[PDB]
């Protein structure tokens, strides 16, 4: 876990008005949720060669497809993995009103083939503590400007720091829960089509699954923090379901 064969290159463009385009194959655990139609509606992260972790508000069906090893979705010329889904294991504690406990585990029919471009993300430990002001990473195919209404063909990366529950409440107040973590308000935002993807904080060499894109500004406001499912507070459930399945 959490070491790309292919090394990412995070430049100062990754930090301003709506990040940058990634080096192809640098976030191997990055997957795209798609229709039978080949329509990207969400992202996910690979934690094994069999399971994918996503956001529960995404509504993935067994009918949907997990596409591994993609850069340019606008291609038709990449070596990608279209894995089928066998079972969707959505948290029972997810609150649809509140968007709390927004984690869903997907069990694959076809195991994915770790490659140079496919690998898994390290999962944290509940005990884990990721300090506010920590600069992290979010990745996806979400809109660049809210005003684009056409998702990007190539993967993007934004550099953004975590926020204290206390300082997010300033912007969201009572909405912000315990199974929620915030990041942003720094010139970068997660937007429509980023949902289920990762918020990865580097821990001791490893890129570690710290958040899942959840929800945020209606309009992908770069001065407002974006909210993500808090992995450490939901990680034990990950272990448990993975174990019992």
């Amino acid at each position: 876990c959490g070491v790309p064969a292919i090394q990412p290159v995070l430049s100062g463009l990754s930090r301003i008005v709506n990040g940058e385009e990634a080096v192809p194959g640098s976030w191997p655990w990055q997957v795209s949720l798609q229709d039978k139609t080949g329509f990207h509606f969400c992202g996910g992260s690979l934690i094994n060669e069999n399971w994918v972790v996503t956001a529960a508000h995404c509504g993935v069906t067994t009918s949907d497809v997990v596409v591994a090893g993609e850069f340019d979705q606008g291609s038709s010329s990449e070596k990608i993995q279209k894995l089928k889904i066998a079972k969707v294991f959505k948290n029972s504690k997810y609150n649809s009103l509140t968007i709390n406990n927004d984690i869903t585990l997907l069990k694959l029919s076809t195991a994915a083939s770790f490659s140079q471009t496919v690998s898994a993300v390290c999962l944290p430990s509940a005990s884990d503590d990721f300090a506010a002001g920590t600069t992290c990473v979010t990745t996806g195919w979400g809109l660049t400007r809210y005003t684009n209404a056409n998702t990007p063909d190539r993967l993007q990366q934004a550099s953004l720091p975590l926020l204290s529950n206390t300082n997010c409440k300033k912007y969201w107040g009572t909405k912000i829960k315990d199974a929620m973590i915030c990041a942003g308000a720094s010139g970068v935002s997660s937007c429509m089509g980023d949902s289920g993807g990762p918020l990865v904080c580097k821990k001791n060499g490893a890129w570690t699954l710290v958040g899942i894109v959840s929800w945020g500004s209606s309009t992908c406001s770069t001065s407002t923090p974006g909210v993500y499912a808090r992995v450490t507070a939901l990680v034990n459930w990950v272990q448990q379901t993975l174990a019992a399945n």
Binding site: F41, C42, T98, G142, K175, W215
Partner: protein, 56 residues
Amino acid sequence: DSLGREAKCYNELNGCTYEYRPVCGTDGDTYPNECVLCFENRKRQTSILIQKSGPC
């Protein structure tokens, strides 16, 4: 001769979820998702509906 379909928000949230699920409004415009059309009706005080799902 027919239908309609109104777009819904999460009220317990005054933000939107980040999924890409375009919806075609009765106005002839594409919304990234449904909560977006709702948040735009609310702020613009409009009453646009969902023609068809997916892009216009």
